[PDB]
Amino acid sequence: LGFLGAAGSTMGAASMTLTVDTHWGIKQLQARVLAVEHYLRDQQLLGIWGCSGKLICTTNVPWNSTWSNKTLSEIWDNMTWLQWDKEISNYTQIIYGLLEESQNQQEKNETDNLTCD
Amino acid sequence: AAGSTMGAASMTLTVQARNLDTHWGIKQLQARVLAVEHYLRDQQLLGIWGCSGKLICTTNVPWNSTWSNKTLSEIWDNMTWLQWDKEISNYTQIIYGLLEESQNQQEKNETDNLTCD
Amino acid sequence: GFLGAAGSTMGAASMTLTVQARNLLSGDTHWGIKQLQARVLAVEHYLRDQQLLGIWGCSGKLICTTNVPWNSTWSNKTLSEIWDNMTWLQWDKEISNYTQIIYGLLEESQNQQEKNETDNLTCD
Amino acid sequence: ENLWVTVYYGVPVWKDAETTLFCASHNVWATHCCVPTDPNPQEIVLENVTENFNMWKNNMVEQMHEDIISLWDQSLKPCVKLTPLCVTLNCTNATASNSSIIEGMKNCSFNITTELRDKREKKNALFYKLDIVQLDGNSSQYRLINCNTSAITQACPKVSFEPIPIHYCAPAGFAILKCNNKTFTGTGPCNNVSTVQCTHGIKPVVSTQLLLNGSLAEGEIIIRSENITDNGKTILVHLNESVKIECTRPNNKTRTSIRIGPGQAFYATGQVIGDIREAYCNISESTWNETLGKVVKQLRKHFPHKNITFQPSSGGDLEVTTHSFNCGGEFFYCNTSGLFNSTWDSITLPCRIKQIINMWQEVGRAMYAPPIQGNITCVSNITGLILTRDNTETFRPGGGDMRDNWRSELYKYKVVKIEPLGVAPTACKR
Amino acid sequence: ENLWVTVYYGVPVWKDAETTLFCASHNVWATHCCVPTDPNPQEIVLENVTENFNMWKNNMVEQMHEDIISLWDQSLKPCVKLTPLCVTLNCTNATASNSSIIEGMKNCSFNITTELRDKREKKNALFYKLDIVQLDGNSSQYRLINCNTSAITQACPKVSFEPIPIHYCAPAGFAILKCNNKTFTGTGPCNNVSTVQCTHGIKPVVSTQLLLNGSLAEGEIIIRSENITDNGKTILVHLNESVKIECTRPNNKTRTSIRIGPGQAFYATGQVIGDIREAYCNISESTWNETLGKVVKQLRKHFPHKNITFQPSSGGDLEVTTHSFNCGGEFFYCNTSGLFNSTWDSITLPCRIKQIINMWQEVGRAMYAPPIQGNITCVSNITGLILTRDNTETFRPGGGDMRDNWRSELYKYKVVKIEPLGVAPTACKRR
Amino acid sequence: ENLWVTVYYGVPVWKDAETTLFCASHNVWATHCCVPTDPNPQEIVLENVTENFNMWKNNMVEQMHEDIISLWDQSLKPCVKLTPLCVTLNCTNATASNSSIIEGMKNCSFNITTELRDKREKKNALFYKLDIVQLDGNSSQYRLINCNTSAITQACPKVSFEPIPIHYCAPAGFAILKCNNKTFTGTGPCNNVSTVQCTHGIKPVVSTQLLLNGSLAEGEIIIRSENITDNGKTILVHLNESVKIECTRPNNKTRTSIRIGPGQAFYATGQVIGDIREAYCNISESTWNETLGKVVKQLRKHFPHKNITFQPSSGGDLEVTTHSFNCGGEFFYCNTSGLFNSTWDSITLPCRIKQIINMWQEVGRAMYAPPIQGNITCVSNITGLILTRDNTETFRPGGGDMRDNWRSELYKYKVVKIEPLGVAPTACKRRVV
Amino acid sequence: XXXXXXXXXXXXXXXXXXXXXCXXXXXXXXXXXXXXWXXXXXXXXXXXXXXXXXXXXXXXXXXXXXXXXXXXXXXXXXXXXXXXXXXXXXXXXXXXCXXXXXXXXXXXXXXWXXXXXXXXXX
Amino acid sequence: XXXXXXXXXXXXXXXXXXXXXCXXXXXXXXXXXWXXXXXXXXXXXXXXXXXXXXXXXXXXXXXXXXXXXXXXXXXXXXXXXXXXXXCXXXXXXXXXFXXXXXXXX
Ligand SMILES: *[C@@H]1O[C@H](CO)[C@@H](O[C@@H]2O[C@H](CO)[C@@H](O[C@@H]3O[C@H](CO)[C@@H](O)[C@H](O)[C@@H]3O)[C@H](O)[C@H]2NC(C)=O)[C@H](O)[C@H]1NC(C)=O
Ligand SMILES: *[C@@H]1O[C@H](CO)[C@@H](O)[C@H](O)[C@H]1NC(C)=O
Ligand SMILES: *[C@@H]1O[C@H](CO)[C@@H](O)[C@H](O)[C@H]1NC(C)=O
Ligand SMILES: *[C@@H]1O[C@H](CO)[C@@H](O)[C@H](O)[C@H]1NC(C)=O
Ligand SMILES: *[C@@H]1O[C@H](CO)[C@@H](O)[C@H](O)[C@H]1NC(C)=O
Ligand SMILES: *[C@@H]1O[C@H](CO)[C@@H](O)[C@H](O)[C@H]1NC(C)=O
Ligand SMILES: *[C@@H]1O[C@H](CO)[C@@H](O)[C@H](O)[C@H]1NC(C)=O
Ligand SMILES: *[C@@H]1O[C@H](CO)[C@@H](O)[C@H](O)[C@H]1NC(C)=O
Ligand SMILES: *[C@@H]1O[C@H](CO)[C@@H](O)[C@H](O)[C@H]1NC(C)=O
Ligand SMILES: *[C@@H]1O[C@H](CO)[C@@H](O)[C@H](O)[C@H]1NC(C)=O
């Protein structure tokens, strides 16, 4: 337990704790504004992917073995999140683009004229 | 890509675009703060209405025949969003008031002590 | 009509929640700093209330039901008294020493709800 | 029993709070308070509410005070400094009048570097005695007053300080509550409260002893104090009727210009033509006596003893014992002893004028006021008296360091923070 | 009969707007326009967008102007204040290179205070006749010109003002639209609109009548004005071919240094080494004349006759009657009357050099340019002309202000605010 | 087919990052670091976590340096300028107290403008020789040594610069990782890494050669350097035991107030009464001898089978050849040649006093220290030495810029950005009603 | 390592129910794999009698015991059960749990359990 | 789904190469496991999918499956290898098993 308490744990166990002077004046404003921007960036991505309010969010995007070809049993019970982040860092934007596309298609189907009303 | 027609499904790309010497420092902070204000303004308006965490939302407010007087096929296939917004259905303050009232009535009905539906 | 319902009963005032909320965001060097500080704080206050509502499960809501019961010690009143005779300004004081307790209970309840939902997903 | 805690957002409640208000409306006030006001301001009456107002602890008074001083000080930066004038002066008796008998002025000559370096000239100007200090005994060697503790800045010639009304407006998340009780009288509950976003227009008038242009009481004469029964406190008497006051300098000045440097010149009185009185104020006698009688009738409800008296301001320096008027560009210091002398067609207040003006009660930051060419008359409305108190009661004109004047307009307003969240029991469980 | 309101967030629309753009990348431009950029063309063609542009009402021109002035004023703050020099100068005719009659130069002596105030020294420096004003008649006594009205600040010798390209970039929520019409005249609808995040890289080159450096028209020579008919408007001519111009001060100069006070020092001309002909600015006779004729052929589209003529500039001060060049650390003021003289091998223009200048059209805060030691040569490309219209029709090489220089490159860009929220009807009612 | 992308939020990962830290808790340090200190920081050990640290590339050090310079200069803005004192000074021998010569000081007279700008007065002041430069050969005419290059600002007599403990704290979204390995040298991997929000309190001490009032090593003496075999690098020796040192100036300097002009005044040394000796400083002899021997024992592990010896600094001005420190507002320059002289009850180190101080490497700025009356004594501990290098291996008490004084405290901290959002495969597809 | 173990097997009377169960605290808590049961009678190979997408509750019982093998799991307890009802008199088999580990391919049936056996009989 | 015990009997002499054949009724991956165990005791995977040789097992004792054809290969028969070979129709829900090959050694 604790902030980053699970940093050395395997991903599986770690997933169970996700619930955890004008010169000076300009520096303070920059710090406050930046903190707000970071907050909004994460919430906006969760919203656009359909994960608003969820610590765990499943999606309709399949896992592509090209990003990683490992078995779940050698990921979740074996490697830490720091290692995982490095392993698939190169596909981060690909995944995000796919998640956005899937969510937008889901919404278009939701309000299509056929079989709605 | 504002050309095409209104039947666009590229909406996520126009959303992720938002939110990314003391004279200079003030100007840059003003630019950042304003970008945040506008983002939040739109989110709050959507949040007051029933559309929260969605890019596309339907409501309980009927469409008025005097706002456009066009069919759905004309609107979605023969026009784009720039023309739509600039020429017709360009009295949006009417709609916004209707949307806020309808939503508050709905939310209030959901907790009526006699019918906790 | 911002605060127009301030003297109205608690029940009646529930119909002006949108009005009161929609006016929370808006509507040389030293001067510029004072104004940036004022705008930044207005944003932070807005966001802190939104974060707290999210903590309690009120994502996008003006009125939220819960799993936390009301304690008769906080206020021993019935619904016909508190919603119909009192205005918000008249009882807010009564809960001034229980507010942190209530907020803590709402947070704990939300955490337990999420855990059950997290452990038991819906698939396929 | 049911009863679950229901969360509400957008609840119309508030708490006392202190924030930064913004100012909304060449001229200095217009330049700074560049923000426009609402052409059709709204006001919301809050029915069935009670609010406690406390003017003596109202942070808006302090905030406006600090912003006014800041504006003033900033406004004097981009113009002429007079340090080069702090040299020994000759100061002969002024000969401006026909018989050389003004006796309130000296003709001072001095050796000053002109705008071109390594070239000095003998220059001269007329100065008021109140701005001149003798360097030693029995010696015609003089100096400007503010040369040993600080330095004098010349007022910027293109900037008007005319007290055009301004409005203070709350930022989002805040609101200003206003008291609508005509007989409020001071700290305590107000039973008729309305909400505004901006205050009414307030004129940043800088008088002392007597308040000039401002609003009048809507009721009877209102006497306000922190504690009227204690001495050592300011008593603000707010009249429901104005008293007309006419002040003038019935003579013609001509200005001379002494070059100081590239971009700079010192302006000074060259010559004065006319009669001897420098200045005076015209107060109708019957109006004044009737006005005090009305004040006393109300004063007696707090002070039942008869034979209440008024006295001519105790004593102190010429910032305290006299009136103070920023009339055009001239600063008048009028003797009010002709008004405050009583036991319970017009009254002349003789007036003196100064050019080196101390700003508020700051140390240094002296300002020099260039002479105003020609003749000047100002007419203004007296709206109230600032009295202090010390058998019978004795009242004297007095006052605090400006905040007390500003308290007379901001007394009816309070700033509150809006607090949209709260909880309440309901019959519906999640 | 069954349509419902649907709210759409992320709608690809915009409205015209005025916002703050940021400027992206010992040089001042390189210190202020600090944001790094990669190529990132991002030229997204919108395909069917036909938007309205107006170069004469474009707020970016004004914004660029305010930022440039601000940068210059900021750049000159941590520099030497030349106030102790507003003293009487005892001047004679300058002598150098065995000649005591150098036109344009005076040898001035003066008494200036040293770091220790109780001591003073007599110094000597050479000055230009355009920097120095006589105090009285029949006298050797002179003063610096701007000591009459304001402070003079010496530009720091270590600071570079080279007009390296800079880019103006939109803040999030805003976009810059580009007009890609090769014959666009500066106003009205423009087809083939594309969207970018930043401008192409604009060089903040300053001039008074010939437009130097920057891009050429990709079409034919384009005549642009707010109103061609109206004689009260500036006409800009954007050439499709450049004219090569070379300027120089081939003579050598030395510099001296005066300790005006603690830390600070004044730089001044020491000696002139060489002949005394200045600037020698020229363009080929084979390029001018023909270029001017091509401009006339285009003028004839609006002025369809053979009574078109070019005359020398009119009156006013040096800053508006001649051609200012920012050649290295020195300011050239060139006589172009030899170019604008026609009715419808190289040509040399004599020029004068000035050191104390009032920038743009501002008053006071004069800047002093320290001398360049050694000789200087500048080569630049004339890309356009600033012309006015003062029966027959006469054009003059002048008029306008300092903003017209940037309108010439910013005319193709517009800033819009993205407004991604709108409403449209659907067949679906909320469930 | 059967694996789906799942989004996880609150994932315990981070990236190396550079951000702006804020400083948490009359004087300057106390008014600038106005933010309250966390009364009970929660240090969290990250079990089975290792991380890479590098004290020589640590931006926390660089940021602290910039904050200090800024505070120093901001603090001195609303103060008296001494530019009017650049006037030629007429100086004699100075004979304070008895009929003798006060070495190290001169009695200088000068013509200074009175409040009136026309007339002048003649005033006297005593100055240290180190602040005064002779204008020509055999002359009696002198000037203040820094009027040639800049303005000299008198420090405000009401403003203390005495170091107070301060804490650097990360902003939301950031955290500081801390190395808790007792023998870690400052670079490379560290096991037993913990997370904190704020650093321990440190003091912005500005001494050179000998570090004063810092923390002590948890383990044995640690020799920290970048590429230790490189003679171009500075060696920081971090002691595990402190050495007590006391410096004293046993006399009373009177204070003369010389008005400059319109609310402006200069504080001059008036007269000096007391024991006229060179501000001597006492360091325990046996403590030092043992301490230095222990350093060599460890230094020999990097330079084995060599005779390690010590010498006084080889060069530079009296800002680096000496031990400079500022304890009571009195700036001391002590001779350490009595310590760094070896062939591996107290040692008196003579000291000089300067009144015009060119701090750091600002060059274009200078501060004048008002005289301090009374008899001043300062007590401090030496907590680390700074050495430079180059069958004898010679070390000298040389040093770098002032960043090195803070590298020695911040060597164990790193700033990282928290990145809570990430994805991984699982075997549960979104239900989609 | 994984340590799945079987429990509560019984010699149930024919047509009786028995709460056969297993647990595997060492293995991932549903974050990975899936529940699977298999059984074998004497002189028999194996059959995939039941399974569940333990991450949630998507059941996939085999037709052979569609009316009885009501497999269920508690992700929270890292445990699973197959409390079959109406045991056939012929339903005598060892039963074991397995981890349906997979990599964008059919599962490997890894980490087989202790296989406690039942003995339903008339 | 279904699969045949194509090698219901599959004895081999020690040190002989061998494979226990499987014939599926349809194309599928063909994960397999060895019943190297007592009755009412755990089985262990030989390979997953078509050719994912099991961890902690000889890789030599493996072959890839294709279409509906598969076999549990062995580099050489040994007494240690004397375990039945169970073939799963590893594509099907509740995958069907072929009766395991005797695979005696
Ligand atoms: C109380 O209110 C009255 C009424 O507004 C103020 O009188 C006004 O005072 C200003 C400044 O002295 C006068 O402005 C000047 O007018 C002359 C006209 O020729 C012009 O040449 C000057 O450049 C300048 O604009 C204004 O006319 C005068 N208004 C009236 C009706 O007389 C009075 O000053 C206020 N008193 C105080 C203490 O604020
Ligand atoms: C105040 O009370 C009266 C009844 O006495 C009621 O009619 C009125 O609506 C109330 N005002 C508000 C703001 O609700
Ligand atoms: C003016 O200067 C003269 C110089 O001789 C001096 O005698 C005289 O007293 C001064 N002042 C007056 C008032 O004359
Ligand atoms: C205030 O003074 C103005 C001067 O023009 C006059 O018109 C107005 O009536 C006066 N107000 C009062 C209350 O006397
Ligand atoms: C008032 O002004 C008039 C001139 O208009 C003058 O005669 C009279 O003496 C003045 N009276 C007072 C009391 O100032
Ligand atoms: C100034 O003098 C003129 C003389 O004609 C007179 O008309 C005007 O009213 C006077 N003004 C003042 C302020 O006394
Ligand atoms: C053109 O300019 C160059 C550089 O000043 C000079 O050498 C050349 O002689 C000039 N041409 C003519 C015709 O003078
Ligand atoms: C001080 O006295 C010594 C005596 O030896 C002499 O050498 C030195 O030059 C004197 N210095 C001054 C400033 O008189
Ligand atoms: C410095 O010189 C002055 C000259 O008047 C003398 O009074 C003073 O005592 C001297 N002080 C010292 C320390 O020599
Ligand atoms: C060094 O002395 C300082 C000041 O007295 C004190 O903070 C520190 O504890 C001392 N260290 C030791 C252990 O003497």
Q: What is the DSSP string of C19-53?
A: HHHHTSS---HHHHHHHHHHHHHHHHHHHHHHHHH
Spell out the long-range contacts of H35-39 with Cβ–Cβ below 8 A and sequence spacing 24 or more.
Answer: H35/H83, H35/H84, H35/H85, H35/H86, H35/H100, H36/H81, H36/H82, H36/H83, H37/H83, H39/G42, H39/G94, H39/G117
Chain G contact set for C122 (CB, 8 A): 56
d(CA B41, CA C26): 9
Whose CA is closest to E167, among E144, E197, E137, E134?
E197
Q: Does any CB of chain D come closer than 8 Å to the CB of residue E209?
A: no
Supply E107's token pair.
């040898």
DSSP code, position E49: -
d(CA D33, CA E137): 51
C7 lines ligand 2 (CB under 6 A): yes
Residue nearest to atom 10 of ligand 5 (CA): D282
Place of tokens 């694996």: F3
Whose CA is closest to F279, among F253, F298, F304?
F253
Ligand nearest to the CA of D383: 4
- For chain D, what's the residue count? 430
Any contact of D with H, at least 3 CB pairs below 8 A? no
The amino acid occupying position E224 is R
Residue nearest to atom 11 of ligand 10 (CA): F381
Chain-centroid distance of CA H46 in Å reads 7
d(CA F296, CA F344): 7
Phi-psi sector, E257: left (phi>0), alpha (psi -120 to 50), beta = beta
E-strand ranges in F105-261 read: 105-113, 120-128, 132-134, 141-144, 152-154, 167-169, 174-179, 187-190, 193-196, 210-212, 222-225, 234-238, 243-249, 251-261
Residue nearest to atom 5 of ligand 10 (CA): F380
Phi/psi for E322 (5° steps) reads -120, -170
CA of F225 to the centre of ligand 10 (A): 26
Angle at D202 (CA atoms; ends D197, D205), nearest 5 degrees: 155
The amino acid occupying position G70 is X
Place of tokens 């002289």: F341
d(CA F210, CA F198): 27
* Residue D374, CB-side half-sphere exposure with 13 Å CA sphere: 3
Whose CA is closest to B22, among F77, A23, A31?
A23
d(CA F121, CA F110): 8
Find the helix packing angle between A22-48 and C29-55, rounded to 10°: 30
Angle at B110 (CA atoms; ends B105, B112), nearest 5 degrees: 95
E-strand ranges in B41-109 read: 56-62
Chain-centroid distance of CA F68 in Å reads 10
Supply D69's token pair.
């001083």
d(CA D137, CA A8): 88
Is E239:E224 a contact under the CB 8 Å cutoff?
no
Size of interface B-E (CB pairs under 8 A): 144
Q: Name the residue ranges covered by the structural domains of chain A.
A: 11-20+54-110
Ligand nearest to the CA of D249: 6
Output the ligand 7 site: residues, CB below 6 A: E 246, 248, 280, 282, 346, 348
Phi/psi for E424 (5° steps) reads -150, 155
Q: Which atom of ligand 9 is nearest to the CA of F272?
A: 13
Contacts of E195 (CB under 8 A, 6+ apart): E42, E43, E44, E46, E175, E176, E177, E178
DSSP code, position H98: P
3-state helix, strand and coil shares in percent for chain H, rounded to the nearest 5: 5, 35, 65
Supply E70's token pair.
């601000």
Q: What is the DSSP string of F301-320?
A: TTSTTSEEEE----SS-TTT
CA dihedral of residues H31, H34, H37, H38 (deg, nearest 10):
80
Whose CA is closest to D234, among D395, D361, D391?
D395
Residue nearest to atom 31 of ligand 1 (CA): D379
d(CA A71, CA A74): 5
Q: How far is A73 from chain C (nearest CA, A)?
A: 18
Q: Exposed e or buried b for every residue in E251-264, given b needs 16+ CB within 10 A? A: bebebbebbbbbbb
F256 C-beta neighbours (distance < 10 Å), count: 16
d(CA A95, CA G69): 39
The amino acid occupying position B44 is Q
Q: Which atom of ligand 8 is nearest to the CA of F91?
A: 13
d(CA E208, CA E331): 12
d(CA E299, CA E2): 61
Is G36:G54 a contact under the CB 8 Å cutoff?
no
Please give the span between the terminal C-alpha atoms of chain F, in angstroms, as a whole number. 20
Contacts of H82 (CB under 8 A, 6+ apart): H36, H103, H104, H105
What is residue D26's three-state secondary structure? Answer: coil
Angle at D384 (CA atoms; ends D381, D388), nearest 5 degrees: 145
F326 C-beta neighbours (distance < 10 Å), count: 18
Phi-psi sector, F311: left (phi>0), alpha (psi -120 to 50), beta = beta
Is C25:C46 a contact under the CB 8 Å cutoff?
yes
Contacts of C81 (CB under 8 A, 6+ apart): none
Residue nearest to atom 13 of ligand 4 (CA): D242
Preceding-residue numbers of gaps in chain B (C–N over 2.5 Å): 20
Place of tokens 């966390």: F38
Place of tokens 């110094």: E123
d(CA D351, CA D372): 16
Pocket probe mutation, ligand 2, options C2, C3, C8, C88, max atoms within 8 Å of Cβ: C8
Phi/psi for D278 (5° steps) reads -75, -45
Q: Does any CB of chain F come closer than 8 Å to the CB of residue C119?
A: no
Whose CA is closest to F51, among F184, F216, F235, F202?
F184
Q: Does any CB of chain A come closer than 8 Å to the CB of residue C36?
A: yes
Chain-centroid distance of CA G45 in Å reads 16
A26 C-beta neighbours (distance < 10 Å), count: 21
d(CA F161, CA F357): 14
Q: Does any CB of chain E come closer than 8 Å to the CB of residue D39?
A: no
Is D121:D336 a contact under the CB 8 Å cutoff?
no
Chain D contact set for B104 (CB, 8 A): none
Method: cryo-EM
Is F420:F11 a contact under the CB 8 Å cutoff?
yes
* Residue E277, CB-side half-sphere exposure with 13 Å CA sphere: 6
Among chain E residues, CA nearest to F82: E262
Q: Using the Cα atoms of residue C23, residue C25, residue C30 and residue C31 in order, give the sign of their dihedral.
A: negative
Supply D267's token pair.
């302006």
